Amino acid sequence: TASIAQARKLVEQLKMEANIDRIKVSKAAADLMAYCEAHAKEDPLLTPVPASENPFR
Template identity: 75%
Template sequence: MTVRGGHSVRGCVSWCVTPGRSFEAMSNNMAKIAEARKTVEQLKLEVNIDRMKVSQAAAELLAFCETHAKDDPLVTPVPAAENPFRDKRLFCVLL
């Protein structure tokens, strides 16, 4: 089988490589192309993500925190009688 200028397929390497360019440069370009394709695919996925303004997100987060503050043991301490982590009191009786 002959292609491009009468060269055989086996001789493809000799004319596929541009004179003055090494295989390293070609592999570097192929790596850059592969990376660019991955970036394009990622951007295609991200284009459909619904965005919201930071001010709106902050307002919703603040409202959520205020609504659930009463259930948060770090904001409203647990009564000592119900706290399983409180220090146990040891009673020592001297005779």
């Protein structure tokens, strides 16, 4: 009596996961590039910071 319930619950979950709207990958990849470009000046691990203001020296 539980197999039918689990199958119907799985179908119900899969129905909800298929009703979303998906954007193109090209636009999605273009937004991660935009984020890194605008914050590359405040990434101390990427751009080395002089030891004057480094608190670990």
